[PDB]
């Protein structure tokens, strides 16, 4: 699955973001803690390469590692935008 | 196969390098035209992720795209360190 980044949330010193993502279909919305050397900004597409390795906007060279995920809740996003900063 | 970068060769404006690589065993030495956002320096290891997608020193987030390859000849390296700069 490809995921559209619906919301982003940053780190003050880390390479991490916390992302709200939803599938094409948007049946499924997830919160994900990711790590990348490149910026992923809302309206970006993440496409699977390998196990938890994704690329940004189909650029294979711009990879991101999913460090963890959960499905979305309004509260869990704020729970998770805490551990983030 | 993993490849050890034996020699590197740069681009003045591109994201490209030309690399001499050899397999562990060093039976096989190749010249390769690659593209990366990260630096690959001699004594680096490139490990396969996917088709022509490699990572540097087993860092999945530091990917490189092989744009083309040939086996090594002394002359072909200089032939190729021309197209490079």
From Swiss-Prot, chains A, B:
Keyword annotations from UniProtKB, A to Z: Antibiotic resistance
Organism of derivation: Escherichia coli (strain K12)
Functional description taken from the UniProt entry: Interacts with phosphorylated BasR protein to mediate transcriptional induction of BasR-activated genes to induce polymyxin resistance in some natural isolates.
One Pfam family matching this protein: PmrD
Gene: pmrD
Effect of residue 11 to D: In strain: ECOR 46, ECOR 48, ECOR 49 and O2:HN / ECOR 50 / P97 / UPEC
Induction notes from the record: By PhoP.
Protein's recorded name: Signal transduction protein PmrD
Gene3D superfamilies: 2.40.50.650
InterPro entries: PmrD_dom, PmrD_sf
Protein family: Belongs to the PmrD family.
GO BP term, example: response to antibiotic
